Amino acid sequence: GQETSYIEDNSNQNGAISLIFSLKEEVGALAKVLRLFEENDINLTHIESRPSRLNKDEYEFFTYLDKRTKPVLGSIIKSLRNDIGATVHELSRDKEKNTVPWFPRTIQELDRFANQILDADHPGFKDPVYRARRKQFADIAYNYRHGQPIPRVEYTEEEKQTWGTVFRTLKALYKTHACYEHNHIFPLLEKYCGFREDNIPQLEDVSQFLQTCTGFRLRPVAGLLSSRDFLGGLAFRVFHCTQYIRHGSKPMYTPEPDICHELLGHVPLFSDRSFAQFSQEIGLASLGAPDEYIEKLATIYWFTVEFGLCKEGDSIKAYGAGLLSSFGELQYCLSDKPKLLPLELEKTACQEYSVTEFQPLYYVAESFSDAKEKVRTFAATIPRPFSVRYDPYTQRVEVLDNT
């Protein structure tokens, strides 16, 4: 009702169900559990057992199931609760009564709904060459799987020209408008990632560089993802980003985020430990959060990662990605025209807004570290039967009970 950046999630015909539960070791305990699944016509391939990372005498179970196993899940949970003796949380992509909204527990699980993507008013609409080019990029994303290198693509002189145009203009604004962290990293992206006016950087190169900075990594995505899916990725320090470029007809406009927006507005700040931790905090807070709060986190993300400004002493600079990759609004956000408010999540979370250019008002963050803590605080109010934390060693989410 304003065309916001919030995108409700969708479930496939199979959806996804995950039973979170641990089990203290006992003679025949492990065999009992697995037998319980196996006996219910559940391929033990979707059943994984690992040593608990919290308690040395427990086992953590991971179940990769879907709506197909719904008819038996009930009895299985009852058995676990009453007979075997375990605390179980049911995750469901369909978010039904008594189930927690599904979220990936392992980095590999980001493959599941990575292809769940959202024309006539958009440039390149009636361009066959462009429409074909776009499908090519969408297919690279569709076929992508975690852990794989990101397919390199040779861009056309025309495309590189479109990039050049956007680059030049922004590069001439950064010094005076971009927050310190952005200006700090950019020179490295220029030196080691091919970030030039006459060159479109390859996603693989950018990804490897990011991992080497904050452990952040890219994942080619076909188009827009649901807010839940996209924000959740951040929890794993994974940035779902596009590989295509806007239509060369209008180099200063994009109905959606293209390679120019991703590389110039996002990448620099994801290379900063402070910003990476802050953005990850938003993702961790989205894990299993109710739709109502995903939307609120979506709004918070919009007024921060996308369109946020930050104090730089007595000065105010921009760090929002939608600002750092748009010369027009980058100049406008720091003008005497927009209304500024201090970052306050309870307020920001319910801030009304539209996706059209030149935002009427912006929120100013004290620092990325302050913003992060504010997110942590806000997350505590999000209704979920437990708390989450990311394990960079195993690249798996740790589900500890509410604190």
Q: Which is nearer to a copy of itself, 274 or 351 (CB)?
A: 274
User: Is residue 84 part of the contact set for a copy of itself (CB under 8 A)?
Assistant: no
CB neighbours of residue 242 within 10 Å: 25
Task: Please report how close the Cβ of residue 244 comes to Fe ion at its closest, in angstroms.
Answer: 14
Task: Please report how close the Cβ of residue 321 comes to Fe ion at its closest, in angstroms.
Answer: 5
CA of 201: how far to CAs of 206, 262, 263, 271, 281, in Å? 7, 11, 8, 15, 28
Label the pairing between strands 88-92 and 100-101: parallel
Task: Please report how close the Cβ of residue 186 comes to a copy of itself at its closest, in angstroms.
Answer: 11
Stretch that binds Fe ion, among 141-149, 244-252, 253-261, 364-372 (CB under 5 A): 253-261
CA of 62: how far to CAs of 42, 52, 172, in Å? 13, 11, 50
User: Is residue 142 part of the contact set for a copy of itself (CB under 8 A)?
Assistant: no
Q: Which does 321 bind (CB under 5 to 8 A by kind): Fe ion, a copy of itself, none?
A: Fe ion
User: Is residue 57 part of the contact set for a copy of itself (CB under 8 A)?
Assistant: yes
Report whether 177 belongs to an annotated binding site.
Answer: no
Task: Please report how close the Cβ of residue 31 comes to a copy of itself at its closest, in angstroms.
Answer: 9
Residue whose C-alpha is closest to residue 355's, from 206, 224, 174: 224
Q: After what residue numbers is the chain broken, C–N > 2.5 angstroms?
A: 118
CA of 47: how far to CAs of 18, 65, 94, 234, in Å? 10, 8, 20, 26
Q: Among residue numbers 288 through 327, which ones bind a copy of itself (CB under 8 A)?
A: none
**Annotation marks residue 306 as catalytic:** yes
**What's the 3-state SS for 342-387?**
ECCHHHHCCCCCCCCCCCCEEEEECCHHHHHHHHHHHHCCCCCCCE
User: Is residue 18 part of the contact set for a copy of itself (CB under 8 A)?
Assistant: no
**Annotation marks residue 177 as catalytic:** no
User: Is residue 56 part of the contact set for a copy of itself (CB under 8 A)?
Assistant: yes
Q: Which does 176 bind (CB under 5 to 8 A by kind): Fe ion, a copy of itself, none?
A: none
User: Is residue 300 part of the contact set for Fe ion (CB under 5 A)?
Assistant: no
User: Is residue 211 part of the contact set for a copy of itself (CB under 8 A)?
Assistant: yes
Contacts of 291 (CB under 8 A, 6+ apart): 8, 9, 95, 101, 228
Amino acid at 261: H
Spatial distance between the Cα atoms of 306 and 105, rounded to a whole number of angstroms: 26
User: Is residue 249 part of the contact set for a copy of itself (CB under 8 A)?
Assistant: no
Is 56 buried (19+), middle (13-18) or exposed (0-12) by CB count in 10 A?
A: exposed
User: Is residue 7 part of the contact set for a copy of itself (CB under 8 A)?
Assistant: no
Spatial distance between the Cα atoms of 90 and 193, rounded to a whole number of angstroms: 43
User: Is residue 114 part of the contact set for Fe ion (CB under 5 A)?
Assistant: no
Task: Please report how close the Cβ of residue 399 comes to a copy of itself at its closest, in angstroms.
Answer: 15
Q: Which listed residue (109, 262, 295, 306) is catalytic?
A: 306
* CA angle, 99 then 91 then 65, to 5°: 125
User: Is residue 353 part of the contact set for a copy of itself (CB under 8 A)?
Assistant: no
Q: Among residue numbers 314 through 353, which ones bind Fe ion (CB under 5 A)?
A: 321
Q: Among residue numbers 24 through 53, which ones bind a copy of itself (CB under 8 A)?
A: 25, 30, 34, 48-51, 53
CB 150 within 8 A of CB 218: yes
Stretch that binds a copy of itself, among 158-166, 218-226, 239-247, 387-395 (CB under 8 A): 387-395
CB 325 within 8 A of CB 265: yes
Q: Which listed residue (79, 90, 261, 295) is catalytic?
A: 261
- Name the 3-class secondary structure at 181: helix
Report whether 266 belongs to an annotated binding site.
Answer: yes
Spatial distance between the Cα atoms of 21 and 37, rounded to a whole number of angstroms: 14
* CA angle, 117 then 112 then 322, to 5°: 40
Q: Which listed residue (22, 181, 266, 326) is catalytic?
A: 266
Q: Among residue numbers 251 through 290, which ones bind a copy of itself (CB under 8 A)?
A: 271-274
Contacts to Fe ion by CB under 5 A: 257, 321
Contacts to a copy of itself by CB under 8 A: 25, 30, 34, 48-51, 53, 56-57, 59, 106, 180-181, 184-185, 187-188, 191-192, 211-215, 237, 271-274, 391-396
Q: Which residues are catalytic?
A: 261, 266, 306, 325
Q: What are the binding residues?
A: 261, 266, 306
Q: What are the binding residues for Fe cation?
A: 261, 266, 306
